[PDB]
Design an enzyme around this catalytic site. Structure first.
Site, short mmCIF file in Angstrom:
data_model
loop_
_atom_site.label_atom_id
_atom_site.label_comp_id
_atom_site.label_asym_id
_atom_site.label_seq_id
_atom_site.Cartn_x
_atom_site.Cartn_y
_atom_site.Cartn_z
N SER A 1 -0.86 15.62 -11.89
CA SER A 1 -1.12 15.27 -13.28
C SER A 1 -1.38 16.54 -14.08
CB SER A 1 -2.33 14.33 -13.34
OG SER A 1 -2.73 14.09 -14.67
N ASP B 1 0.84 -1.20 0.00
CA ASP B 1 0.00 0.00 0.00
C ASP B 1 0.87 1.25 0.00
OD1 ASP B 1 -1.90 1.90 0.33
OD2 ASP B 1 -2.39 1.39 2.40
#
Length: 330
Positions: free
Chosen positions: A199, A35
């Site tokens: 992004s 994770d």
């Protein structure tokens, strides 16, 4: 040194991926959920409340000649999905794919929440976010990667998750045969303890690319892609009959639909998520309403590039003094 381990989807939907981890001496192999959105290595154990164990493999520290109680240390964690676990702490030898760390903090669960009990395939978590998020008290502990870093050939790990198939976690090297083209690297903020990046925009299907900054985290422990409501609405508007269902908890779509792809930007590069990766199947057995793999991050407080996004890429987690992320197509 290096390590390399195969990671395997737990079910036919890729809801999560499990990677075998050797703990203790002799080794006890547990299948952990790696994770990159958390920083605790915790396991089902011989200390876990018996009614909360249902099919998981447990770590028994008393059977490990290298286990040592970390005196006074406790841990307690709550995840973004509302699940939680807590317990005490041992140090022990931990190996992943041939890479060994001695003295790793292994957090033994005394209690786990129902969602963990109900998932027999996941024996615990191995956190790969920054050690500043580790919950051990009163002495915070380091992640497996943090402990291994100095010994690795290069201070990196890579995630290469498969679509409906196994993939690979590598430590200490970048497998140049595992991706196409070049890796585009992008800046990371560690201020929240995550692999947080920005992004450069998105496209829906064959549509035009929208240049817009989308801050979010690269999180292998989250199944879906969680993005701003504007972006998510633009995606699902291209699927006839798709709608947000308050009762189901997100966007659903007719199982008869063909889903468009979703592209996200990494610098000037583009990662394409095929439409099929966005199908999470019937909301309940036999239903013709299917659950979408792109959902709104409104109310979560952060955008999350979870498995839906990451499995479309070869992803480099560069843990150099100034960390960065890399993405390549594959």
């Amino acid at each position: 040194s290096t390590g390399s381990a195969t990671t395997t989807p737990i079910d036919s939907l890729d809801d999560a991926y499990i990677t075998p981890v050797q703990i203790g001496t002799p080794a006890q192999t547990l299948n952990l959920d790696f994770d990159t959105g958390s920083s605790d290595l915790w396991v089902f154990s011989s200390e876990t409340t018996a009614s909360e164990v249902d099919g998981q493999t447990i770590y028994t520290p008393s059977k490990s000649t290298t286990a040592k109680l970390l005196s006074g240390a406790t841990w307690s964690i709550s995840y973004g999905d509302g699940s939680s676990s807590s317990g005490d702490v041992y140090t022990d030898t931990v190996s992943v794919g041939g890479l060994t760390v001695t003295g790793q903090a292994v957090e033994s669960a005394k209690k786990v929440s129902s969602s963990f009990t109900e998932d027999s395939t996941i024996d615990g978590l191995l956190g790969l976010a920054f050690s500043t998020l580790n919950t051990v008290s009163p002495t915070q502990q380091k992640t497996f990667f943090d402990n291994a870093k100095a010994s690795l050939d290069s201070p990196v790990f890579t995630a290469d998750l498969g679509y409906h198939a196994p993939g690979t976690y590598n430590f200490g090297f970048i497998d140049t045969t595992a991706y196409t083209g070049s890796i585009t690297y992008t800046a990371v903020s560690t201020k929240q303890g995550f692999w947080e990046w920005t992004s450069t925009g998105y496209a829906v299907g064959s549509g035009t690319f929208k240049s817009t900054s989308i801050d979010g985290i690269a999180d292998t422990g989250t199944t879906l892609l969680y993005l701003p409501a504007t972006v998510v609405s633009a995606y699902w508007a291209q699927v006839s009959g798709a709608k947000s269902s308050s009762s189901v908890g997100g966007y659903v779509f007719p199982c008869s639909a063909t889903l468009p792809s979703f592209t996200f930007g990494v610098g000037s590069a583009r990662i394409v998520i095929p439409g099929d990766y966005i199908d999470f199947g019937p909301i309940s057995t036999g239903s013709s309403s299917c659950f979408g793999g792109i959902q709104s991050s409104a109310g979560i407080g952060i955008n999350i590039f979870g498995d839906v996004a990451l499995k479309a890429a070869f992803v480099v987690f560069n843990g150099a003094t100034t960390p960065t992320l890399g993405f390549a197509s594959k």
